[PDB]
Each structure stands twice: as C-alpha cells, then as structure tokens.
Amino acid sequence: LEYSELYPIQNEYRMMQSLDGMWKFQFDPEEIGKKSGWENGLPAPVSMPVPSSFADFFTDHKERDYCGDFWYETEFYLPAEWRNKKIWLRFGSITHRGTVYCNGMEITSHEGGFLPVLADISTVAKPGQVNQVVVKINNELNETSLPCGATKILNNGRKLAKPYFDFFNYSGLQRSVWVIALPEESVKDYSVDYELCGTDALVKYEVVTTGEHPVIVRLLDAEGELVAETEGKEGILQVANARLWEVRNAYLYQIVILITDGNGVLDEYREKIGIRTVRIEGTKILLNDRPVYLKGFGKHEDFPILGRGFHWGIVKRDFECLKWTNANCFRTSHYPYAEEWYQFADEEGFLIIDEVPAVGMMRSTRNFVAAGSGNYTYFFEALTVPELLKSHIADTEEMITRDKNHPSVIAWSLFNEPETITDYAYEYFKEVFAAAETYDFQSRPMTGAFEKNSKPELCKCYPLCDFICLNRYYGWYISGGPEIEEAEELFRDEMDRWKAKELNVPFVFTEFGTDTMAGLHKLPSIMWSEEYQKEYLEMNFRVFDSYEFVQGELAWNFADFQTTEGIMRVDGNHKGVFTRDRQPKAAAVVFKDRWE
C-alpha cells in the first residue's frame, strides 16, 4: 500500500485532529459536480452528520433511497505547528467509493466502502489557515467491486441500488474522519507473530518505515514496564513469564516502535497487542494450544438512525449483551467493521472472524435481481469476474494489513455465500486465499461462509479453508414450521455426508436463525414467533452436538438489522436474538444458558 493503515495516535511526533461533526452535503443526481466546480465548495448543501449513514435522516423516499454520486464538504483549521509534517486526511471509510479533494485539488480515490482511505494532502495543505475538504462519493452496486449488486435506472432516470446481499445499502461517511500529521520519516506498518515457549513467549516482528534510519522496538507490560527490547526492522522480542491474551480474559502489552538517528528520536508508534497463538489441529481450533469452542454471533454495523454510523455507545452496549450471553466470538458479517470494534474486542478478550465484503456473489440472486424487470438472457461474467477478483484481493490486502495485529482477530473470512461448485470458482478463490496468506504475517486460519448450494458433493472450494463455516437454515428457509422434523432429518443427512468425507477439519456454523417478531407469541409456536425461535435453536443445537467436528456456533444475527424493503423483510431482518435497540427476545436466554 502507498499509505499506512496504522490507527492514528497523538504524541510528540504525530498529531491528529477530528473532523467529525456536521458536514455540508449535496446529492448530485445529474452528475454535474466536477464540471461545475463542486470540488471548490458545494453550491446548495444541507447539513450531514459525520460519522453516520445518510439515509435514515430524511423524511422522503427519494433522499433515503438515493443512489449515485453525492458530495460532502467541511473546513478545518490546520495548526501552524504542523508545517514540517506529512499531513494526511484519514477517513475510517468512504462508502462505497470516492475521490478526495483538498483545497480544490484532487488527492486520491478509493474503491471499497469499509476500510480506511488515506489522502496525502502535504502538498496542498495550508498550515495556520482554514483548509477545505470535499469528497465525491458514489454508492452504486456492480459486479466488479464489493459488495456486489446492480443499479437499476427507473423510468425517470432515477437510480436505485439493487443489492445481491441481505442488508440495506447504507452509505456516506460512516466512520470518523481525522486530519493527521506524521514525521517525514515514519513507521508505516509493522507485523507481530507469536510463539509460546513454556512460561515464556517470543514476539517476532517486522517494521516498515518510510526511511533508512535505525529502528528500536520495545515491549511494555500492562503497567508500562519494559519487558523486552531489541533493534532492527526485523527481530524477536523475548518475553519471560509472558501473560498470555486469553479468551474472555485479555492481557495487552504495548509495542513501542522508535525510529532514531542516534542523536534523537524521529518517530514513535505505539499500539496495544496481545500474546496469543491460533492454529487448527485436526478438528480443533487451538487458542494458546488449548481447544476453544466458538460461541457467539454474526453482527452488523447497524443501529437506529445512525445506520452503520460508528458510535462507542453501540460498542459498549453490544459487548455488555455479548458478555451477558456468555459469548466469546463474533464474525464481522459482512465487511470489516470500524477499527474501534477490534480495539474493544482486544480489551474484552473476544475472538473475531474478520470478514472481507465478498458477499453477493451467488448466481441465483444475481439472476433474480435481473429478472425482476427485466432480463433473463444477458449476463457477462467472463468479463467482470477478473475485475471483481482484483477488487476482492485489494480489499483483502487492506483488511489484513489494517487488522493483523489485533489479538482478537483469529481468522479471516474471505467470502459469504458465493458460488463454489465450479473449477472456475476454485481458481478464483485460490488467488484470494494465496493473497491473504501473503499479506498475513501470522498466516492465521482462513475460511469463508458457505451457503447450502455448496453441497458436499459439489463444492470445489472448501479444501482451501483451514476450517469450514456453514450458513444453514434447516427449519427456516428449508422445511420450516410444521416441517421442522423433516428439517432436522435433512440437516442430519447433510452433516452425515460431511462426516463421511472425514475431512479432519473443524466446522463452525456461522449462521442459523429464524425471523422473529418481538412480542409475537403462539402456543403451539409458529414461524416468526418468539417460541419458534427457541424451538428452532434447540433443534439446531441437537444437530450440532451430534458431530465431533463441529467446534463453533455463531447465530444469525446478534440483532435485528436494516435490509432493503420487500415482501420478505418486515422492517429489515428480524433474525436478531436481540432487537435493534439491543434488548433480548426469549431466545437470548437460551443462548445464555447453553453457553454458560
């Protein structure tokens, strides 16, 4: 990467100033902004909170559902004392793609809506003056970038996003924005990897800087005491009597990376890390050499009004709920979350399966969204797939570079419900997995979540995985309700087929659930009732517990969340175990009791 993914810090060498607040915002349905000079200021803006998704503020459909180009603008005073620094705009994300301007000048563009965008404004920044940032953003969906979908043009020319995925197309500036100042020679990246040696541990590391001066690396314990120190851009820190980062029992050291010229220090980067190992051994997931059974949820970045907008309050409530259920794990379904989620998981000892936004790659869904009105003959995969692969690999590189040093991150999920039953899909995913392994200094477990279409007899992609994640809805989409006994039979039949393959890898259920409307009670239960959610879960548990190789269960979903409206979604997806405002349905206690 031609920029650093490192989270920004404030110290003697590095400065940061938040640009969060009310920005100026303007929709550009006619796509006239750039030729009209909007990069120098929006002509008729409204106010827009940052961070937030824009959609749910408005009271009219066309603004909520807006699809196309739209622009953000703000101004900030740059301290004069930042003069002799490399000055960057850092967006937590720009959803889905955008071009950043500063003081009227084009700085950078980015594709991918869920990872940081770094824009080097050093050459146009005006220290000791007010500066301007303008961002052109686009939220259309296509088949050459993630997540996948289509864009429909309505009779009036109005665009409408048509996802191939089951979540609302929230977009905008959904995460915090900073302007930061770095030393001219700085720490750009580092990687740690761990080895356990009895009571001791080794922290292997690499550091990438933007210069040639010597590097010193120190490790401090949770009290700030020096426990190890070495020199060089590559090395090993030896930690006596190491306090390991444990599941639901975190311990964090602080790594301190210094660039020196002998006379003094040029840069200092510090970050909390946790000494822990993760590996797959047969059907076991080993954390610090001991098996762990994953218990938790797929989540979303989703909350009323804010949409995917980041807020520490959502983090705090969600973790309190997670702990109350006795969970130990979540998957970042279906995109990398704001960095703060991982920082907090590190502190709380939660395990994370970190997922790239490779969702929407199922052919039947694509075809369905094309058949709506209307198309049944024209598709061009041969042309788009190579471009999609490039985008997928780029997002993977960005995710892993951003997240690798979190002790919480124990696995990469490289897809959710793609086509996997052709040799072509194998060749596609082989490249993604190869890239992931190359970018991950730890070479930690890699996986993806498979839809039921990936039958054990047909799937060509599970051998790429270190463990296999299954999304299954036996008792919801398949043989629901009065047919639930048949659902259980079908589920056991499938798992018997997996069993007979004797793959000797762990299986984790990454999704299972039922839409459940809080307050819908029925005796006997019906699909959509709270009681049916409980019974469905009990049936699933009986199945899970029948197979030795099943080593985790992440329910879909932690909480009800927003989707595109339609005949199958009653104000979003109601498969939450909690409501959207984070309160438990009856099924939450079922998990609490089982996971205790």
Sheet holding 278-281, edge to edge: 278-281, 284-287, 290-291
Which partner in ligand SJ5, a second copy, none is near 154 (CB below 5 to 8 A by kind)? none
Q: Is 140 a catalytic residue?
A: no
Paired strand residues for 573: 561
Which partner in ligand SJ5, a second copy, none is near 511 (CB below 5 to 8 A by kind)? ligand SJ5
Answer yes or no whether residue 511 interacts with ligand SJ5 by CB under 6 A: yes
Nearer Cβ to a second copy, position 501 or 521?
A: 521
Which partner in ligand SJ5, a second copy, none is near 574 (CB below 5 to 8 A by kind)? none
Q: How far is the CB of 308 from ligand SJ5 (least distance, A)?
A: 14
Known binding-site residues for beta-D-glucuronate equal 166, 334, 416-417, 477, 511, 556, 569, 573, 575
Which partner in a second copy, ligand SJ5, none is near 523 (CB below 5 to 8 A by kind)? a second copy
Distance between CA 423 and CA 550 in Å, rounded?
Answer: 27
Q: Which of 134, 113, 104 is nearest to 23 (CA)?
A: 134
Nearer Cβ to a second copy, position 317 or 390?
A: 317
Q: Which residues, including other chains, have CB under 8 Å from residue 210's CB and lie 6 or more apart?
A: 184, 185, 186, 188
Q: Is 271 a catalytic residue?
A: no
Which partner in a second copy, ligand SJ5, none is near 417 (CB below 5 to 8 A by kind)? ligand SJ5
Q: Which of 490, 425, 437 is nearest to 462 (CA)?
A: 425
Q: Which residues, including other chains, have CB under 8 Å from residue 193's CB and lie 6 or more apart?
A: 203, 204, 205, 441, 442
Q: How far is the CB of 123 from ligand SJ5 (least distance, A)?
A: 42
Show the 3-state SS of 177-216: EEEEEECCCCEEEEEEEEEEECCEEEEEEEEEECCCCCEE
Distance between CA 372 and CA 458 in Å, rounded?
Answer: 28
Q: Phi first, then psi: give them for residue 317, nearest 5 degrees.
A: -60, -45
Nearer Cβ to ligand SJ5, position 166 or 395?
A: 166
Q: Considering 397, 417, 488, 494, which one is annotated as catalytic?
A: 417
Q: Which residue has the tokens 């999920």?
A: 413
Which partner in a second copy, ligand SJ5, none is near 99 (CB below 5 to 8 A by kind)? none
Nearer Cβ to ligand SJ5, position 292 or 369?
A: 369
Answer yes or no whether residue 166 interacts with ligand SJ5 by CB under 6 A: yes
Strand pairing class (290-291; 284-287): antiparallel
The binding track of 180-219 with respect to ligand SJ5, each residue x by CB under 6 A or -, is ----------------------------------------
Nearer Cβ to a second copy, position 55 or 588?
A: 588
Distance between CA 280 and CA 296 in Å, rounded?
Answer: 19
Q: Considering 140, 268, 397, 511, which one is annotated as catalytic?
A: 511
Q: Which residue is nearest to ligand SJ5 (CB)?
A: 166
Nearer Cβ to ligand SJ5, position 218 or 575?
A: 575
In eight-state DSSP terms, residue 541 is: H
Which partner in ligand SJ5, a second copy, none is near 520 (CB below 5 to 8 A by kind)? a second copy
Q: How far is the CB of 586 from a second copy (least distance, A)?
A: 6
Which partner in ligand SJ5, a second copy, none is near 316 (CB below 5 to 8 A by kind)? none
**Which residues inside 80-119 make contact with ligand SJ5, applying CB under 6 A?**
none
Element (H, E) at 353: strand 351-355
In eight-state DSSP terms, residue 528 is: B
Which partner in a second copy, ligand SJ5, none is near 497 (CB below 5 to 8 A by kind)? none
Nearer Cβ to ligand SJ5, position 417 or 553?
A: 417
Q: How far is the CB of 167 from a second copy (least distance, A)?
A: 23
Nearer Cβ to a second copy, position 497 or 522?
A: 522
Number of residues lying near ligand SJ5 (CB under 6 A): 8
- Return the number of other C-beta atoms located less than 10 Å from residue 153's C-beta: 11
Answer yes or no whether residue 573 interacts with ligand SJ5 by CB under 6 A: yes
Q: How far is the CB of 376 from a second copy (least distance, A)?
A: 42
Q: Which residues, including other chains, have CB under 8 Å from residue 441's CB and lie 6 or more apart?
A: 191, 192, 193, 206, 404
Sheet holding 177-182, edge to edge: 15-18, 177-182, 86-91, 117-120
Q: How far is the CB of 422 from a second copy (least distance, A)?
A: 45
**Helix extents (H) in 422-572:** 423-439, 484-501, 530-544
Q: How far is the CB of 49 from a second copy (least distance, A)?
A: 28
The single residue among 471, 529, 533, 540 that binds ligand SJ5, judged by CB under 6 A, is 471
Strand pairing class (550-555; 15-18): unpaired
**Which residues inside 388-427 make contact with ligand SJ5, applying CB under 6 A?**
417
Paired strand residues for 528: 516
Nearer Cβ to ligand SJ5, position 327 or 362?
A: 362
**Which residues inside 515-544 make contact with ligand SJ5, applying CB under 6 A?**
none
Q: Which residue has the tokens 């940061």?
A: 16
Nearer Cβ to ligand SJ5, position 396 or 471?
A: 471
Which partner in a second copy, ligand SJ5, none is near 471 (CB below 5 to 8 A by kind)? ligand SJ5
Q: In the complex, which residues of this chain contact a second copy (CB under 8 A)?
A: 321, 324, 517-523, 530-531, 579, 583-586, 588
Show the 3-state SS of 415-426: EECCCCCCHHHH
Q: Which residues, including other chains, have CB under 8 Å from residue 488's CB and lie 6 or more apart?
A: 474, 475, 539, 542, 543
Residue 497 in contact with residue 507, Cβ under 8 Å? no
Residue 18 in contact with residue 80, Cβ under 8 Å? no
Task: End-to-end CA distance of the chain: give it in Å, rounded.
Answer: 43
Distance between CA 54 and CA 375 in Å, rounded?
Answer: 31
Answer yes or no whether residue 365 interacts with ligand SJ5 by CB under 6 A: no
The binding track of 222-261 with respect to ligand SJ5, each residue x by CB under 6 A or -, is ----------------------------------------
The single residue among 85, 575, 580, 585 that binds ligand SJ5, judged by CB under 6 A, is 575
Distance between CA 494 and CA 526 in Å, rounded?
Answer: 25
Known binding-site residues equal 166, 334, 416-417, 477, 511, 556, 569, 573, 575
Answer yes or no whether residue 472 interacts with ligand SJ5 by CB under 6 A: no
Structure tokens given for 240? 């006596």
Q: How far is the CB of 6 from ligand SJ5 (least distance, A)?
A: 31
Which residues make up the interface to ligand SJ5 (CB under 6 A)? 166, 334, 417, 471, 511, 556, 573, 575
Question: Could you give the residue numbers annotated as active site?
Answer: 417, 511
